[PDB]
């Protein structure tokens, strides 16, 4: 991985720095690294692609080196380097694609393709140089087993889940009490509804709770908490629990009461925020516990009093809500996120070449299934393919 990353980085630096008119002092070290790469790859035969529709490609390297004494690079030097750069870029792109389309239950972190396995030989270690990207840095630290993490903007940590729970119900679904939530990406919208508006509840307070377990520990996370769940704020017709029938929801939004957000790690309360909205910080957690309450307004204007009678029928259903968006976080494991394109790259490569479904990843690289069952083996293979995808995107 480090050798493949070094190949890609050398080629990117060759494209960027080997330009017409540049001082040779600007590229002396880069030219040395490029010539080392040519020297190491020369005389080696590579084969990439025998899986799905990825065609069998054979790579031979017999390229000449680059000059080292001129003062300023000219068009001749760049023309000489460009053909080698193109061939090497094609080779690296195909190696990255070959590695991205492979998985193993036993050793998912080890190279799977024949080409990357050959590049793990000792003789290719000479190609290795600066490993400065975030993903390669994490790769090396994690190989050494050092505390390292990835920074995500809008981490895709919650598998899709639109569900409801009815604590009070009956076959006619006319006097209900419960919670409905959407868990999607970095967003949690939860809404606790009481059809009776807590007329008969003790102290006229009804308590709703929502517990979300994250499949990986998020650290140094910035969260936006808002007191309304706009997703569950309009009339809906909702399938029953078993799909036997449909029930009617007619929300009237009351502000949530006694809002408490607890960020817990292994059942230990790490962060607690009471009646706090806006930006909050969750330093280290794997579980989110949202506790809110519906309180009857002790004083109601005539229209408000008309909304909530003493007994049934209940035509307007009192709802409180919360919205929790993870703006950014840090996680020791790789995740899909709104900023990076690693998951998109891997999925695109797998789909374009009809890669047969393996024994590790869900078919079609579905992220909801992947994050629902994010096992250590899946984490290993996902880190491998994501690092390869970043390496490839460095050039392609």
């Amino acid at each position: 991985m480090d050798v493949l990353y070094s190949l890609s980085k050398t080629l990117k630096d060759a494209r960027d720095k080997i330009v017409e008119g540049t001082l040779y002092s600007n590229v002396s070290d880069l030219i040395q690294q490029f010539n080392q790469m040519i020297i190491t790859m020369n005389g080696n035969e590579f084969q990439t692609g025998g899986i799905g529709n990825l065609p069998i490609r054979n790579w031979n390297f017999d390229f000449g080196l680059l000059g080292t004494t001129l003062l300023n690079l000219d068009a001749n030097y760049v023309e000489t380097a460009r053909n080698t750069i193109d061939y090497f870029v094609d080779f690296v792109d195909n190696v990255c694609m070959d590695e991205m389309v492979r998985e193993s239950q036993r050793n998912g972190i080890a190279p799977q393709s024949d080409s990357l396995r050959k590049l793990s030989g000792i003789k290719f270690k000479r190609i290795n140089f600066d490993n400065s990207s975030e993903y390669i840095e994490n790769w090396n630290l994690q190989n050494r087993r050092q505390r390292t993490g990835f920074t995500f903007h809008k981490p895709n940590i919650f598998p899709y889940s639109a569900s409801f729970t009815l604590n009070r119900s009956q076959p006619a679904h006319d006097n209900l009490m419960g919670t409905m939530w959407l868990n999607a990406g970095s967003e949690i919208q939860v809404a606790g509804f009481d059809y009776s508006c807590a007329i008969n509840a003790p102290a006229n307070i009804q308590q709703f709770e929502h517990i979300v377990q994250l499949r990986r520990v998020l650290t140094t996370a910035t969260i936006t908490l808002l007191p309304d769940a706009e997703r569950f704020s309009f009339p809906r017709v909702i399938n029953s629990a078993d799909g036997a029938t449909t029930w009617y929801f007619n929300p009237v939004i009351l502000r949530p009461n006694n809002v408490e957000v607890e960020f817990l790690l292994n059942g230990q309360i790490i962060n607690t925020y009471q009646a706090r909205f806006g930006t909050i910080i969750a330093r280290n957690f794997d579980t989110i516990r949202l506790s809110f309450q519906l309180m009857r307004p002790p004083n109601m204007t005539p229209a408000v009093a008309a909304l909530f009678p003493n007994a049934q029928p209940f035509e307007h259903h009192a709802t409180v809500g919360l919205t929790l968006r993870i703006e950014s976080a840090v996680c020791e494991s790789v995740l899909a996120d709104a900023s990076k394109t690693m998951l998109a790259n891997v999925t695109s490569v797998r789909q374009e070449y009809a890669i047969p479904v393996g024994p590790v990843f869900p078919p079609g690289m579905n992220w909801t299934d992947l994050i629902t069952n994010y096992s250590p083996s899946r984490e290993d293979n996902l880190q491998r393919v994501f690092t390869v995808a970043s390496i490839r995107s460095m050039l392609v």
Partner: protein, 246 residues
Amino acid sequence: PAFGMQRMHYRNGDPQTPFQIAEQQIQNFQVANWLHFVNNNQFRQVVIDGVLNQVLNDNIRNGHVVNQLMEALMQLSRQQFPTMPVDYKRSIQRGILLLSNRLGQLVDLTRLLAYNYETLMACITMNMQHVQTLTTEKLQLTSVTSLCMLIGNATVIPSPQTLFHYYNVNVNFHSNYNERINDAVAIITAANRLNLYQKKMKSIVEDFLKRLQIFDISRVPDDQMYRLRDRLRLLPVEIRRLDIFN
């Protein structure tokens, strides 16, 4: 012998040199890395001001690679030489250390040699074409030992007048070469266009070679003479001579 390895049975004509095989067959990082450099330290080609130039690796120019050499042979001084007689082993190791302990002097020597090469190569006007010549220049390795063991720290660089003289000689030779090519081509083309079918281009080629001042024409193979005739025939005439002929 240092690493206890079986002596290499090198087969002549092998596409790999003995060092290229030893690089794969030796696991020690110092010696293997030095062997890798030695294997891959060929001349690089670059066109400067329209002249092809054979340039050295930047590690040769700054003399840094000598450190690796030292590293490698320092490891050779520590080796056991499993089955070697201890007196001969000691002598080899002490010679290895004789060369090793001159690391600074050898770095200076490498930088000096590379700098002199670059400076005098700046004064070359004809392409530095690399071909394996029929006859070689014999280099005694005792002279290499003398240079390695006697070089001090007095920098010597080509004098500006020496550089100008070298450049002038190169320019004069190149200009004379081109002018005599032009004369030969003009006379051959004129004889052909004048329909002088009994004219012998061999005499023209011999005169051309004589005017180059560095060829003993009595020893030029006939096939090469006729090849020179053909190549001269294929060239186009120079504008001034062609206009006068017109």
